[PDB]
Every structure is written in structure tokens, then in C-alpha cells.
Coordinates of C-alpha atoms in Angstrom, one line a residue:
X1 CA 0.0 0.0 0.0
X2 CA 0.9 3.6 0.0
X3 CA 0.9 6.7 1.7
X4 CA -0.1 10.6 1.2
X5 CA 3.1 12.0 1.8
X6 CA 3.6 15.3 0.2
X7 CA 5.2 14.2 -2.8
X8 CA 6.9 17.1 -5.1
X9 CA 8.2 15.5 -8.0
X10 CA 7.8 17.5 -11.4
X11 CA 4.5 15.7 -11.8
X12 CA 5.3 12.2 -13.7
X13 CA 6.3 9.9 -10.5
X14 CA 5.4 6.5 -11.5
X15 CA 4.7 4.8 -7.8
X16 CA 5.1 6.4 -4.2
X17 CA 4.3 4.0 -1.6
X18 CA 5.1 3.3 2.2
X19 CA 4.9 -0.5 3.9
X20 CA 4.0 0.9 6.5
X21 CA 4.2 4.7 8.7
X22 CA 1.5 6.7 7.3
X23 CA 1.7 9.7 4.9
X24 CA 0.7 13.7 5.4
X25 CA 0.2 12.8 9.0
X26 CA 2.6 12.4 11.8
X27 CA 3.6 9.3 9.8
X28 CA 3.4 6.7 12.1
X29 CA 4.5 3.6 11.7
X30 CA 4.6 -0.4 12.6
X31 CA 6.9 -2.8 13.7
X32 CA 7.8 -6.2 12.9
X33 CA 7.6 -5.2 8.7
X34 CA 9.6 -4.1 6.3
X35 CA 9.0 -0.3 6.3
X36 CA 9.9 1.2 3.0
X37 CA 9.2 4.4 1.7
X38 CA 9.2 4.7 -1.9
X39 CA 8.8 7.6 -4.6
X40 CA 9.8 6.4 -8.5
X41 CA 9.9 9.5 -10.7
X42 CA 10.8 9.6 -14.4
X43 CA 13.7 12.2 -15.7
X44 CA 11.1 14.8 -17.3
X45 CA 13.9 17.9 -16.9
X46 CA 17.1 18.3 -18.8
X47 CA 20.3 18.5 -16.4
X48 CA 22.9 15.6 -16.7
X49 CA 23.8 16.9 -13.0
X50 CA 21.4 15.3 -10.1
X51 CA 21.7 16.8 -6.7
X52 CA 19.9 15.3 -3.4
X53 CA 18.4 15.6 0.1
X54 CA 17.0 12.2 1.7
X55 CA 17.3 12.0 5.5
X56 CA 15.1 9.3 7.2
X57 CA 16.0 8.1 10.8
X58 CA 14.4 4.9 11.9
X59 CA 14.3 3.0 15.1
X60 CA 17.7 1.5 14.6
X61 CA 18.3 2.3 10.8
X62 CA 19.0 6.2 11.0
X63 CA 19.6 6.7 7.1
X64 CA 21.1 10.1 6.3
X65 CA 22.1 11.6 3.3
X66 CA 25.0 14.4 4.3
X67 CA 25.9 15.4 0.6
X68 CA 26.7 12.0 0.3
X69 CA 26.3 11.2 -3.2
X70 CA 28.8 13.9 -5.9
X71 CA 25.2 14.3 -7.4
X72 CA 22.3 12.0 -7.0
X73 CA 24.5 9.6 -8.3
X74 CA 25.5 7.1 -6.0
X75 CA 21.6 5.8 -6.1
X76 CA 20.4 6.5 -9.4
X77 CA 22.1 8.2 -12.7
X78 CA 23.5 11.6 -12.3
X79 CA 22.1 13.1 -15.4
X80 CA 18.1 13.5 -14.7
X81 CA 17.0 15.5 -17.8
X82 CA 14.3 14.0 -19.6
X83 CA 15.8 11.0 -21.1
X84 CA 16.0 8.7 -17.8
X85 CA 14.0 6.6 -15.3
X86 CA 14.6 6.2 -12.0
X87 CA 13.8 4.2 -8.9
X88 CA 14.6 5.4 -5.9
X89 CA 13.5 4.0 -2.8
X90 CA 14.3 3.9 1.0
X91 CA 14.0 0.1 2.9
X92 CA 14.6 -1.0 6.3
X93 CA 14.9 -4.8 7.3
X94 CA 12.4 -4.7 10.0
X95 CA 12.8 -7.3 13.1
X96 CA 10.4 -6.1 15.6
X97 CA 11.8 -2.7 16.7
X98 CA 9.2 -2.6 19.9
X99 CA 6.5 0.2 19.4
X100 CA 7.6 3.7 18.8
X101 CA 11.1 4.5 17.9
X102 CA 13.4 6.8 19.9
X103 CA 12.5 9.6 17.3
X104 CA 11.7 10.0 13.5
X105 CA 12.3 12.2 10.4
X106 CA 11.5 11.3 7.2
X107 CA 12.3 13.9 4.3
X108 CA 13.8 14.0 0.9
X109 CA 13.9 15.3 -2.8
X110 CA 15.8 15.6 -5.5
X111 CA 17.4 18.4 -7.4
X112 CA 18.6 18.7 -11.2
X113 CA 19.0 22.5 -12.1
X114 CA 15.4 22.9 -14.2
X115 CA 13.5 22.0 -10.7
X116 CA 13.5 20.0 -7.8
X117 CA 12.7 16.5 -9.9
X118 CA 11.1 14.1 -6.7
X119 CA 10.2 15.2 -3.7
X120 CA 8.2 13.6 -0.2
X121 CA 8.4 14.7 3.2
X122 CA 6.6 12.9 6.2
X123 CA 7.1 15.4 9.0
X124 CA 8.0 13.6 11.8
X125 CA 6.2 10.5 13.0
X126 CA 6.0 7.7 16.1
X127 CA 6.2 4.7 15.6
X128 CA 3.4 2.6 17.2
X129 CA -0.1 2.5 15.6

């Protein structure tokens, strides 16, 4: 199933979907699944540099994304333009994790140099419901 995060791709994402946490909302989320955000977009711009901003924390799987990447590469392709398709995505091998996690943050997008290509923020969230 999915979510309603925010989503702010150019408009063309092909699947943006959750296992799990709750979109728009305080996200929150279950234990004992597989929680993976996801949020496929298509390269609809025209910039062979890619750019990036994901930072998710999880209850024992805080992903960050401190200008990891050179350029939204080390995921995906660098060069976004309109001739590419992504995939993205964001998983987290999920044990049990007990009910609510010690703090959440679940945010992201990417960047070209048209427009901010994908895009989904959770705000927060507590893990639990």
C-alpha cells in the first residue's frame, strides 16, 4: 500500500508507496515489517547533474544523506534530464523494533538545475499505531 506523503516530483512519479508509517500525517508507523518508503519518478527535466536531500531516521536504521552522493549519483544516474527513469526508494529490514522509535524524520527530494525532480516529506512520525 501507500501513503499521502507530500510528494513534489515535477509531476510524472510512477509509484510512491510506504509499507507501512502513514503519509501527510505524523507518519506513524509499525513494527515487525519491512517499512519502505518509496517515490519512482521519471527524468522529465534536462540537467545531466542530479543533486539530493534524503534524511530518514528509523528506530535503529537512521539513514542520512550528508551530501553523500557527488550528485544523486551514488543511487540513481547523475544526469536526470528528460531522457532517464529512475527508482529510488528507502527500505529497512524490519525485526520487531518494539512500538515507537526513539525519534523519526522522514524527508527528501531531489534536485537537477530545471526543478527539484522528486520530492516527499513525512514530518516527523512515532512509531506505534
Amino acid at each position: 500500500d501507500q501513503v499521502d506523503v507530500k510528494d513534489c516530483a515535477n509531476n510524472e512519479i510512477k509509484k510512491v508507496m510506504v509499507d507501512g508509517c502513514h503519509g501527510s500525517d505524523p507518519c506513524i508507523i509499525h513494527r515487525g515489517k519491512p517499512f519502505t518508503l518509496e517515490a519512482l519518478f521519471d527524468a522529465n527535466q534536462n540537467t545531466k547533474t542530479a543533486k539530493i536531500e534524503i534524511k530518514a531516521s528509523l528506530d535503529g536504521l537512521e539513514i542520512d544523506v550528508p551530501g553523500i552522493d557527488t550528485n544523486a549519483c551514488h543511487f540513481v544516474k547523475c544526469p536526470l534530464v528528460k531522457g532517464q527513469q529512475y527508482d529510488i526508494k528507502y527500505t529497512w529490514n524490519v525485526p520487531k523494533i518494539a512500538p515507537k522509535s526513539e525519534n523519526v524524520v522522514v524527508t527528501v527530494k531531489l534536485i537537477g538545475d530545471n526543478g527539484v525532480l522528486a520530492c516527499a516529506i513525512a514530518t516527523h512520525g512515532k512509531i506505534r499505531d
